[PDB]
Amino acid sequence: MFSNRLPPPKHILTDQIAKNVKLDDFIPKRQSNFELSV
Amino acid sequence: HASAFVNKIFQPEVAEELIVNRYEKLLSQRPEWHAPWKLSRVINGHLGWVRCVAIDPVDNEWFITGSNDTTMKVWDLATGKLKTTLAGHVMTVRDVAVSDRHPYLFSVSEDKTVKCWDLEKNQIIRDYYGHLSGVRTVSIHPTLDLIATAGRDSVIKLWDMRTRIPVITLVGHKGPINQVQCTPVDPQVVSSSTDATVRLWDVVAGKTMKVLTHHKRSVRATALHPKEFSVASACTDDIRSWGLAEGSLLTNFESEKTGIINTLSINQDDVLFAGGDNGVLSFYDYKSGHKYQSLATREMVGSLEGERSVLCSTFDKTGLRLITGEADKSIKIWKQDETATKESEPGLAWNPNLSAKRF
Amino acid sequence: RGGISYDQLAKLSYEKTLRNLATQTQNKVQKDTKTGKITIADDDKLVNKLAVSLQSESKKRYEARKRQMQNAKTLYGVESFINDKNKQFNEKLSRESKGSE
Amino acid sequence: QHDMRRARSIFERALLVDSSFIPLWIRYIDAELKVKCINHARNLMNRAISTLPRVDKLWYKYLIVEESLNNVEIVRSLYTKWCSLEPGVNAWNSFVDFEIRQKNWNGVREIYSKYVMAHPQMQTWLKWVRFENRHGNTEFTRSVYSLAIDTVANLQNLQIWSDMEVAKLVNSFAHWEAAQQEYERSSALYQIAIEKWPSNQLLKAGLLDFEKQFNSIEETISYKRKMEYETILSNYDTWWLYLDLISEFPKQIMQTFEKAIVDSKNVQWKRYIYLWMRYICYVELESL
Numbered sequence: 001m002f003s004n005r006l007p008p009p010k011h012i013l014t015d016q017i018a019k020n021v022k023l024d025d026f027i028p029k030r031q032s033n034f035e036l037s038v
Numbered sequence: 039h040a041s042a043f044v045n046k047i048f049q050p051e052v053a054e055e056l057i058v059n060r061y062e063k064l065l066s067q068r069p070e071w072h073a074p075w076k077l078s079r080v081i082n083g084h085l086g087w088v089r090c091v092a093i094d095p096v097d098n099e100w101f102i103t104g105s106n107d108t109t110m111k112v113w114d115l116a117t118g119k120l121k122t123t124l125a126g127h128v129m130t131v132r133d134v135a136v137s138d139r140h141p142y143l144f145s146v147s148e149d150k151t152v153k154c155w156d157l158e159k160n161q162i163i164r165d166y167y168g169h170l171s172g173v174r175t176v177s178i179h180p181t182l183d184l185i186a187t188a189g190r191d192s193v194i195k196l197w198d199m200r201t202r203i204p205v206i207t208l209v210g211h212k213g214p215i216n217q218v219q220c221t222p223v224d225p226q227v228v229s230s231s232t233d234a235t236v237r238l239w240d241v242v243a244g245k246t247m248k249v250l251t252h253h254k255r256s257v258r259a260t261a262l263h264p265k266e267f268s269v270a271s272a273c274t275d276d277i278r279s280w281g282l283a284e285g286s287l288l289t290n291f292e293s294e295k296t297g298i299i300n301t302l303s304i305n306q307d308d309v310l311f312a313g314g315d316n317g318v319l320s321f322y323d324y325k326s327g328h329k330y331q332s333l334a335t336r337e338m339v340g341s342l343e344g345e346r347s348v349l350c351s352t353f354d355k356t357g358l359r360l361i362t363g364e365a366d367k368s369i370k371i372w373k374q375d376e377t378a379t380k381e382s383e384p385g386l387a388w389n390p391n392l393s394a395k396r397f
Numbered sequence: 398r399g400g401i402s403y404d405q406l407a408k409l410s411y412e413k414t415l416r417n418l419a420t421q422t423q424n425k426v427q428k429d430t431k432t433g434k435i436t437i438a439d440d441d442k443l444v445n446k447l448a449v450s451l452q453s454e455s456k457k458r459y460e461a462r463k464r465q466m467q468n469a470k471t472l473y474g475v476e477s478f479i480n481d482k483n484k485q486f487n488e489k490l491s492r493e494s495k496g497s498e
Numbered sequence: 499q500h501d502m503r504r505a506r507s508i509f510e511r512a513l514l515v516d517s518s519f520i521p522l523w524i525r526y527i528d529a530e531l532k533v534k535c536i537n538h539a540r541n542l543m544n545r546a547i548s549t550l551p552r553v554d555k556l557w558y559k560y561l562i563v564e565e566s567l568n569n570v571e572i573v574r575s576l577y578t579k580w581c582s583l584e585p586g587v588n589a590w591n592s593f594v595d596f597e598i599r600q601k602n603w604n605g606v607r608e609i610y611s612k613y614v615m616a617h618p619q620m621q622t623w624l625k626w627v628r629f630e631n632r633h634g635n636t637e638f639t640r641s642v643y644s645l646a647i648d649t650v651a652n653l654q655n656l657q658i659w660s661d662m663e664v665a666k667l668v669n670s671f672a673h674w675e676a677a678q679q680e681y682e683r684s685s686a687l688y689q690i691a692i693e694k695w696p697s698n699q700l701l702k703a704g705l706l707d708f709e710k711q712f713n714s715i716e717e718t719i720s721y722k723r724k725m726e727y728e729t730i731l732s733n734y735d736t737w738w739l740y741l742d743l744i745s746e747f748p749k750q751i752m753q754t755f756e757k758a759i760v761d762s763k764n765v766q767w768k769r770y771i772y773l774w775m776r777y778i779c780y781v782e783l784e785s786l
Contacts, residue, residue, distance in 0.1 A: 027288070
């Protein structure tokens with residue numbers, strides 16, 4: 001914590017827009033762990 | 039630790055979703071060490087560009103290469119000497135492939151033809167017919183007596199090998215196909231055209247299992263990994279690795295500011311070569327993506343500056359020897375440099391960049 | 398400033414159109430589970446204004462290009478030509494060679 | 499010809515040849531809209547942004563159309579999905595501007611709370627700073643500053659931020675606390691930030707600018723050493739050695755003078771003669 005070293009002051013259709021595109025098709029799977037059993 | 043500090047305060051719904059987590063994991067992840075490469079011998083003897091090279095998949099004693107003077111040549115691997123020459127195309131030879139089940143050399147060319155050479159008598163046995171323009175690609179099926187060829191025709195033809203009938207034609211792309219790889223289980227043909235897609239084909243049904251649209255430009259080179267059941271696809275600076283049988287994105291390779299990548303190759307112990315059109319040949323770890331060596335091919339005596347570019351490459355069967363053929367009509371062999379250890383030649387020190395948002 | 402990208406010209410066009418929409422403003426959802434179709438209940442007005450806005454904007458841009466054609470067709474001070482298309486080609490060569498060196 | 503079905507079939511056949519071409523998508527959306535067929539264009543803009551999600555103009559087209567019909571829930575949902583795909587800062591600044599124009603003051607904090615994680619730089623934290631100074635309390639802006647600075651001090655094991663960027667953050671914290679009459683907290687802040695990072699000299703210059711604006715000999719020594727490094731990089735160095743020996747302690751000045759005597763073709767030889775003469779005179783004032 002950097003802040004505690006300071007003194008105190010004295011004064012509906014959302015899921016329907018694009019169902020085909022998802023975030024997790026962008027992230028590589030061997031990014032997090034290497035040595036993955038493919 | 040620090041990710042606990044981020045996760046308890048910012049509270050992502052999925053911890054994998056947030057970018058500081060996906061960047062802290064890569065710094066803690068620590069890739070593997072590989073040895074640096076060097077030049078071993080250089081072999082002259084063609085009268086045009088060395089467009090394509092193939093290796094003996096059994097005995098590892100010779101490597102054949104086709105070229106731009108419309109002749110293929112079988113060179114001795116160990117000594118570098120020229121054993122023999124093969125003519126039979128009238129325009130240049132785009133790709134060669136030697137079978138491992140039968141003594142057959144299937145050569146492909148730009149004059150719209152596909153031929154089958156016997157290696158027991160060194161003659162042409164079987165000619166194949168049906169491509170509207172010049173084929174640029176041969177793979178051979180691992181267990182089923184097929185040929186898969188492709189060109190500017192925008193289709194993949196899967197030739198029977200006995201009756202030489204174009205049995206199955208895969209109609210999917212929107213441009214010439216640059217690479218076709220054959221695969222023994224149900225993503226059986228994996229191709230890559232110049233409309234920035236890579237397709238995984240169901241050859242029994244006739245349709246596509248999955249289209250991979252991640253690249254931005256033409257995919258010029260692909261490679262199968264010998265011990266992994268995964269594929270690597272190259273682009274104009276975008277090398278990715280893909281799993282087969284699902285179609286995942288397994289890893290992105292830090293491959294920026296390298297130019298047009300002509301060829302790829304994959305060693306047994308997770309090395310990935312990627313020779314470029316700017317004469318730069320760069321070596322990657324496969325599981326990580328880290329580029330640990332870059333080299334430049336000094337071209338020739340009275341050559342040009344544009345005439346240095348690796349147009350084709352392969353690895354040895356034992357894997358410790360790289361064979362490239364450059365645009366300066368010459369054949370160059372690269373070597374693992376057995377002396378160096380982890381402390382002597384470390385690499386490029388693994389500093390992944392949060393900027394470019396690709397890691 | 399030079400050439401501008403597409404991701405930036407897109408935002409500048411969006412912001413100009415919203416600025417226009419604010420000055421123009423100055424002067425539900427039903428899911429049928431039988432088919433799956435969504436009917437959004439929009440008013441008849443603000444559809445007419447959208448259509449007339451697009452029509453008037455396209456006519457304005459069209460007339461601006463039409464007047465630019467005549468004012469670029471009067472000025473003969475470029476180079477010697479033999480038809481109407483050579484004049485445009487020679488003006489293209491002037492525009493590239495003046496900017497290059 | 500007022501035949502809309504043939505025009506639709508022609509535009510679809512036109513897309514099958516070339517889907518990468520954006521003016522064709524825009525004409526077909528406009529050709530739906532001008533004849534007042536809004537649902538056809540909604541289906542079409544859906545198919546456009548789901549076909550090519552990395553194209554900015556298509557999302558902005560669908561946002562214009564839903565604004566022009568006054569459908570604010572749809573525009574919020576569209577920017578929610580559009581921000582969900584990690585787009586880039588134009589999309590985020592558009593959404594914070596949308597939620598400013600709707601005067602939902604509570605929601606803009608949620609947008610910035612995701613936007614400081616989608617893009618970590620100090621320019622995004624400082625944008626949320628300036629919003630909290632304009633439309634928030636002193637306490638919210640104070641908590642936002644604290645949430646900035648503790649994450650900056652924590653996450654240096656990743657090394658996202660450079661030195662000038664951290665210095666810009668700390669200078670903003672300090673000058674705002676000085677505007678809020680908390681001088682003790684500001685000076686203590688510079689103490690802790692100098693303690694945390696020793697080598698960020700931009701932060702030290704910010705400290706000295708604050709203390710001169712609101713000690714002296716250490717400032718002269720630090721500015722003289724910085725100007726000496728700058729004049730060694732420029733070359734000059736003799737006046738640097740003189741100002742260092744006037745400032746110094748003096749053993750380092752003597753060893754640096756010996757290094758400058760090593761560092762010593764007309765003005766070159768003249769400066770060499772002057773430097774060797776001054777070094778020999780300073781040695782003679784203090785045989786071999």
